[PDB]
Amino acid sequence: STVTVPIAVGESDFENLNTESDSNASFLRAARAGNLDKVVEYLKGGIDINTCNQNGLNALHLAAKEGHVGLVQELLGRGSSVDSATKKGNTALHIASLAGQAEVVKVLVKEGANINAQSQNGFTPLYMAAQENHIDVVKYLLENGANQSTATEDGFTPLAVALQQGHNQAVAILLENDTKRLPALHIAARKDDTKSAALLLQNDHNQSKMMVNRTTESGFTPLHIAAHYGNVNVATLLLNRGAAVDFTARNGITPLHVASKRGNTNMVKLLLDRGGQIDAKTRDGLTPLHCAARSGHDQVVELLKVVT
């Protein structure tokens, strides 16, 4: 009876262990320490730039973990492939983001690292920077195209992990992105973020003054938004958690009005199934049927006529 976002755990740090072929190990230790001169010397000496440990970390991965900007530049300069993945499927960009190494993030991004790459647990750089509350990396990633909506295979998002981890600022930046002002649940409805919705809703159990039925200025609920954008999943969740199916906004507008006006067929279906009133009327006499007609959404009309 729990909603629980998965946590990116990072790479190991065996190279930090003081010793108390072996050329390779020593080379990786030099990378971990950020000793450019030593690393360059080994490379000149012929050691392979792609040398990695049992977990698949090369020197680029180690320099990035540790914020060694200069060294990251040198390795990149020498042909280190920006997006080599470790065995967990992490790129240097994942690692730097989890670790909050902002200058390193910049350097990798400018080198064309894939800003939306997913690890084999489905995590993105943004998910990592978000999980760990690395604000500046978050902002930087957003400003550079990173997509908040790229999700673990179970729909886990940066917003969801920021929420679970209690990170107010992260949550703010994530909610406030690409808008130039709705409540969070509403925004989660827009985005169709069931997990984040679930998280937000975890403390009202039992209709009117429930959080699931809070309104915006114009009296819309998360359910109205869901209906507007045609987000069936998040709508289903809200309705399961007690959203009033026939809740009227300004002008007696119901979620069914909204979905009918936007020709959102499956929303209409869902709302009907949950008992939404087929014939409710706006302050000016419109029915869901009329709203759809005035909008050429025939798909709906048909469906809507059948029911009657």
Numbering used by the authors: 1113 to 1132, 2029 to 2188, 2192 to 2217, 2221 to 2322
Q: Would you copy out the relevant sentences from the publication that reported this structure?
A:
Surprisingly, we found that the C-terminal part of the ABD (ABD-C, the 27-residue motif identified previously for ANK repeats binding) binds to ANK repeats with an affinity ∼15-fold weaker than the entire ABD, indicating that the ABD-C is not sufficient for binding to ANK repeats. Based on the structure of the ANK repeats/AS complex, we predicted that the Nav1.2_ABD-C may also bind to site 1 of AnkG_repeats with a pattern similar to the AS peptide. Unique to Nav1.2, the binding of ABD-C extends all the way to R1 via charge–charge and hydrogen-bond interactions. We noted that Glu1112, which is completely conserved in both Na+ and K+ channels and mutation of which in Nav1.5 to Lys is known to cause Brugada syndrome in humans, occupies the identical position as Glu1622 of AS does in the ANK repeats/AS complex.
Ankyrins are a family of scaffold proteins which play essential roles in connecting numerous ion channels, cell adhesion molecules, and receptors to the spectrin-based cytoskeleton beneath membranes and thereby provide mechanical support for plasma membranes and control the activities of excitable tissues including neurons and muscles.
